[PDB]
Amino acid sequence: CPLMVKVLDAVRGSPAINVAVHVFRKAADDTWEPFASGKTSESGELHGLTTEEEFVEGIYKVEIDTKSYWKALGISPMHEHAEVVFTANDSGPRRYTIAAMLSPYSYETTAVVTNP
Amino acid sequence: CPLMVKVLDAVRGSPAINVAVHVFRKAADDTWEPFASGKTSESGELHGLTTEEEFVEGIYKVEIDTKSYWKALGISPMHEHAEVVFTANDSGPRRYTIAAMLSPYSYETTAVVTNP
Amino acid sequence: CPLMVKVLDAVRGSPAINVAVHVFRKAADDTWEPFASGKTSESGELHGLTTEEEFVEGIYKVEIDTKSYWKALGISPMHEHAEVVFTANDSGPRRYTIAAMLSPYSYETTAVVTNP
Amino acid sequence: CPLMVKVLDAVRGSPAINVAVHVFRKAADDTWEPFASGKTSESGELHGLTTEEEFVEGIYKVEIDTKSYWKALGISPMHEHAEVVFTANDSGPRRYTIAAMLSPYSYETTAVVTNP
């Protein structure tokens, strides 16, 4: 798993289950090329987005669609969405975990990088 | 001041001085219309972005260009930039403060809303 | 103002008004000596805690009593309180702002340091 | 594992390896009774702190000793330590994950609660 996404609901203190996550890769011609997508599991984690073969060097955008998750919980949020736009494998491949804590008014993201 | 932006350097624990900030307003035809821009002052704050007359209801994007600020401090960051995309004045006008704590690998944003 | 405290309610996205704040200074004999205290104002800020004469070098604890603030809003929180324990004026006097974002389950603090 | 602790180094974007963690349980006579302790592993996680039999209802303090971890990395930090003081099993037993993102000047904690 070269890329994992984990989402927490910071208001309720619990994993954010079934949040949509889309990943894009910046193309040669400056456009956002769709790369992979999925939904967080009951642990708040999304595995299997990509492979070590597919996950090349690049600029990657991770869009987490928070708006609809709050609606299932009866909330209208402030942020439309959350984004993490980071450069990947710039110096050889890494394992990346994009971590997101959400709220109706705040959000942290962190890119946690390790090696295999 | 219906809209203020404040940026902190969470690594050094100090205001983030002279960071570029661009604000856009989602247009009728789904495009990001440029709205206002500026640079943070020595307190890390950016005032005078807009007026109560200009700052209508809408979906607004605040782009904080972190990448170049780290370069002036000798750092290559992970995130290309930071964004806050929020809906404004949805229920009458408010005062908004978008607050940003930055790092080479993490970032919080919060939308702090009050009335006049 | 060598020491300022600012508290935000990260759940509601607004200043945290009338939160109790106690500051202690580590004494010579390892004990927490009471130093100053107050309540946040309508901006979420607490000014006038101390003076440049009184605010000597030391280890200082800032206790923010979150539990009772949530009760006034009908909430039972997870954290009993929030604390920031930091060393001050270690290399000459500074201005310190202790910043706190709260929630029933999460909390950031940051020590933001500047000079006069 | 009714109680797990995970620590991230938010400055370097990586797990915080071999951080000391002490847990205390508030005793009947208002004192902090030592409960369990350990060191984070290479993933930044600390497992096996306690058992479902030992981890009763109570007020628990988790002390993460950040100061010495920065020293191994050549840093003098601002915060002496990080603490999370939370009430546990108040309404039946839960699984708790205390999550910590650290820095020389900032720190988040979150209590992430789930059921088995």
Residue numbers in the entry:
A (entry chain A), B (entry chain A), C (entry chain A), D (entry chain A): 10 to 125
From the publication, what sentences describe this entry?
An additional mutation (S117E) has been introduced here in the sequence of the double TTR mutant, to obtain a triple mutant, which is characterized by a stronger tendency to dissociate into the monomeric state in solution, in comparison with the double mutant. However, crystal packing in the presence of high protein concentration led to the formation of the TTR tetramer, whose structure has been determined. On the contrary, crystals of the structure presented here for the triple F87M/L110M/S117E TTR mutant belong to space group I222, where only one monomer is present in the asymmetric unit, and the tetramer is generated by the crystallographic symmetry. At variance with the structures obtained from crystals belonging to the space group P21212, in the centered I222 space group, the molecular symmetry of the protein is fully coincident with the crystallographic one. In both cases the tetramer generated by the crystallographic axes is equivalent to that of the already known structure of TTR. The triple F87M/L110M/S117E TTR mutant in solution is characterized by a high propensity to keep a monomeric state in solution, greater than that of the double F87M/L110M TTR mutant, even in the presence of the strong fibrillogenesis inhibitor tafamidis. The main reason for the pronounced tetramer destabilization could be due to the presence of the side chains of two pairs of Glu117, one towards the other, in the inner part of the cavity for each couple of subunits (A-A’ and B-B’). The distances between the two Oε1 and Oε2 of Glu117 residues of subunits A and A’ are in fact 5.15 Å and 5.06 Å, respectively, thereby generating a strong electrostatic repulsion, provided that they are negatively charged.
